[PDB]
Amino acid sequence: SLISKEELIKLAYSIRPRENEYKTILTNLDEYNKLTTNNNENKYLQLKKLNESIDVFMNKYKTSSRNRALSNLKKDILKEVILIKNSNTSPVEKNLHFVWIGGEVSDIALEYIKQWADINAEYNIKLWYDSEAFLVNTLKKAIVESSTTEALQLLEEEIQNPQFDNMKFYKKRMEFIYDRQKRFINYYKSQINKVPTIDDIIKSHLVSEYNRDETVLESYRTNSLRKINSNHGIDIRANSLFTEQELLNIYSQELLNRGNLAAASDIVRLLALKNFGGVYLDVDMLPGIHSDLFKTISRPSSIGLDRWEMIKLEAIMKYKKYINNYTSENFDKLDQQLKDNFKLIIESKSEKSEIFSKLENLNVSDLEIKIAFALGSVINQALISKQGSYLTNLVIEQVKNRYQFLNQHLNPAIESDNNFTDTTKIFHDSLFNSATAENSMFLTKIAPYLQVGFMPEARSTISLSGPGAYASAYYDFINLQENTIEKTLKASDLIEFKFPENNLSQLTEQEINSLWSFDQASAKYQFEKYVRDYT
Ligand SMILES: O=c1ccn([C@@H]2O[C@H](COP(=O)(O)OP(=O)(O)O)[C@@H](O)[C@H]2O)c(=O)[nH]1
Ligand SMILES: [Mn+2]
């Protein structure tokens, strides 16, 4: 066990009589050692309480002779965390969570989900949706289309100049995008004083402001609702996932104010795991390839490890056709002897499960959450966690704490009723006065929050509901803290939380398509398409 109260008394000497903060430490040390409980969260919390009481002392008495022995004890506490999390492991609840909010779910997403279904016939599959918001994506399309045209009519004479910089286009368009969102939101607020749905209001707004037939829009709603209930769909609003008002407001400011489905989705995946436990997966993930499968086929030295994994999938698809119209462009580049060898291997396999791994058992700790990796960094596109896991609750806290930081400076900025430019200067001015050595990177990364999705290089979502929130919660757990903004674990500490590598295929056609590339070059590119399609 941890060292005893009676030997800390020996090692933590001082000429001074026992300070009360040191007495409390002794009491926490005895409480912990003398625990009978086998409840890991209980054990962990008692560890956390002890470690908190050590830090108070060492901060109050920075020169006590007791600090060496209390420092060595903190080192032993850090080791105890790992002992606790490795002490009662078991498999996870056999649920798969997928999420599709915002519009009609694609046939192609349904095809990828069906792969998971077939291989893992004993998992209960849930496809989360929001019955209130099938028209959000449609609305955001219309606003961006109208704004593009507005910006081009305004910039038309300056665009003739060959040294014109497309960034000025993107700033201009975003002003227009902001005003259109604002009008919609104020219209929304005005209609909810009595009890209408988001779709009712989007529908009315589209007919009034964007020349839409209510009957076309209604058919899209009913059809998209039908198609998702026929495919494992389950409505977030009927199962009361949001019990906390704080979290519902976060999901609504993403779903409604910004119209950011990715971010609104990040909230939902965590609540799903918290309430039901199991495995979350983005709809562009595929099951893992059997490990042996292509061991007799050596990767050419000209082809990166990544393309090689992309190729193995294309091979299975070209010969098994699990998914219709799956790209072949990379498999085609191979020398005929490779192609043949792939065809021999694949076409000699009888059943789908001889090709793809099944999850089967996923034996993990009830304290933890496991997560996919990319380039040695975490990425929230696959998740494993037991129902009500502590680390799952920590990630929620991080997200709450991060949005609370954000709205502190943003809400006063928006309530002031200004245009996008004045709103931004007000927002930033406030934001950068909060700056410390602790948070300055986080601050400059959520500074372009309002333009995420509409302008190149806005990636605030990463630091709010995405990986940034996860990386910090992993730090908080290992180091028995709360609410860390920026601090990170070394690679070897991080690795324990990896999603089992062979149980996932992360390099899919859709993953690659749906992957962020709104950099300065694709903005150049996209701008020319706009100028080309102008009238
Ligand atoms: O219109 C959308 C697009 C995104 N998503 C959710 O966000 C996840 C990830 O989106 P995407 O793959 O496009 O983003 P990426 O991870 O590549 O940045 C999807 O699996 C969906 O659950 C959604 O619900 N509606
Ligand atoms: Mn993706």
303 forms bridges with which residues in the sheet?
none
Asked if residue 55 belongs to a known ligand binding site, the reply is no
* Claim to verify: residue 349 and residue 437 sit in the same structural domain: no
* Claim to verify: residue 257 and residue 114 sit in the same structural domain: yes
Q: Cβ neighbours of residue 138 under 8 Å, at least 6 residues apart?
A: 103, 202, 206, 217, 220
Q: Where are the alpha helices (DSSP H) in 192-304?
A: 198-209, 214-229, 245-252, 261-276
Q: Cβ neighbours of residue 39 under 8 Å, at least 6 residues apart?
A: none
Residue with token string 């910039």: 155
* Claim to verify: residue 186 and residue 204 sit in the same structural domain: yes
Question: Residue 174 in contact with residue 420, Cβ under 8 Å?
Answer: yes
Question: Residue 250 in contact with residue 399, Cβ under 8 Å?
Answer: yes
* CA 29 – ligand 1 centroid, Å: 47
Radius of gyration, alpha carbons of the chain: 27
- The domain boundary, picked from 319, 338, 357, lies at 357
* CA 510 – ligand 1 centroid, Å: 11
Three-state SS at 496: helix
Q: State how far the Cα of 37 lies from the Cα of 39, in Å rounded to an integer.
A: 6
Which DSSP category does 91 fall into?
E
340: exposed, middle or buried (C-beta count within 10 Å: 0-12, 13-18, 19+)?
exposed
* Claim to verify: residue 334 and residue 274 sit in the same structural domain: no
* Claim to verify: residue 303 and residue 164 sit in the same structural domain: no
Q: Which amino acid is at 20?
A: N
- The domain boundary, picked from 88, 116, 143, lies at 88
Which of 207, 358, 374, 206 has its CA nearest to residue 286? 358
The residue whose C-alpha atom lies closest to atom 13 belonging to ligand 1 is 514
Q: Cβ neighbours of residue 160 under 8 Å, at least 6 residues apart?
A: none
Ligand 1 atom at minimum distance from 510 CA: 12
E-state strands within 100-189: 124-129
Q: State how far the Cα of 231 lies from the Cα of 227, in Å rounded to an integer.
A: 7
- 19 dihedral zone (left: phi>0; alpha: psi -120 to 50; beta): beta
CB atoms within 10 A of CB 432: 13
* CA 112 – ligand 1 centroid, Å: 14
Q: State how far the Cα of 511 lies from the Cα of 516, in Å rounded to an integer.
A: 10
Question: Residue 246 in contact with residue 253, Cβ under 8 Å?
Answer: no
> How far is residue 435 CA from its own chain's centroid?
25
* Claim to verify: residue 317 and residue 399 sit in the same structural domain: no
Record the tokens describing residue 119, joined without a space: 């291989």
Report in angstroms the alpha-carbon separations of 1 from 5, 26, 79, 211. 12, 15, 11, 71
Question: Residue 383 in contact with residue 470, Cβ under 8 Å?
Answer: no
Which DSSP category does 92 fall into?
P
* Claim to verify: residue 106 and residue 223 sit in the same structural domain: yes
E-state strands within 36-177: 89-91, 95-99, 124-129
Answer yes or no: is the C-beta of 513 below 6 A from any ligand 1 atom: no
* Claim to verify: residue 343 and residue 216 sit in the same structural domain: no
Q: State how far the Cα of 380 lies from the Cα of 399, in Å rounded to an integer.
A: 13
- Spell out a b/e string for 26-41, using b for 16 or more CB atoms within 10 Å of the CB, else e: bebbeebeeeeeeebe
* Claim to verify: residue 377 and residue 437 sit in the same structural domain: yes
Ligand that lies nearest to the alpha carbon of residue 134, given by its number in the listed order:
1
384 forms bridges with which residues in the sheet?
279, 370
Question: Residue 286 in contact with residue 357, Cβ under 8 Å?
Answer: no
Question: Residue 462 in contact with residue 263, Cβ under 8 Å?
Answer: no
CATH of the domain at 69: 1.20.58.1190
Answer yes or no: is the C-beta of 504 below 6 A from any ligand 1 atom: no
Three-state SS at 284: coil
Q: Cβ neighbours of residue 290 under 8 Å, at least 6 residues apart?
A: 354, 355, 356, 357
The residue whose C-alpha atom lies closest to atom 17 belonging to ligand 1 is 515
Answer yes or no: is the C-beta of 379 below 6 A from any ligand 1 atom: no
* Claim to verify: residue 181 and residue 328 sit in the same structural domain: no
Q: Which amino acid is at 108?
A: I
* Claim to verify: residue 137 and residue 280 sit in the same structural domain: yes
- How many structural domains are present in the chain? 3
Question: Residue 177 in contact with residue 419, Cβ under 8 Å?
Answer: no
Q: Cβ neighbours of residue 54 under 8 Å, at least 6 residues apart?
A: 25, 70, 73, 74, 77
Asked if residue 116 belongs to a known ligand binding site, the reply is no
* Claim to verify: residue 247 and residue 300 sit in the same structural domain: no
Range of the domain at 64: 4-88
Answer yes or no: is the C-beta of 426 below 6 A from any ligand 1 atom: no
Which of 329, 249, 271 has its CA nearest to residue 99? 271
Q: Cβ neighbours of residue 415 under 8 Å, at least 6 residues apart?
A: none
Question: Residue 434 in contact with residue 409, Cβ under 8 Å?
Answer: yes
Question: Residue 122 in contact with residue 74, Cβ under 8 Å?
Answer: no
- The domain boundary, picked from 336, 357, 378, lies at 357
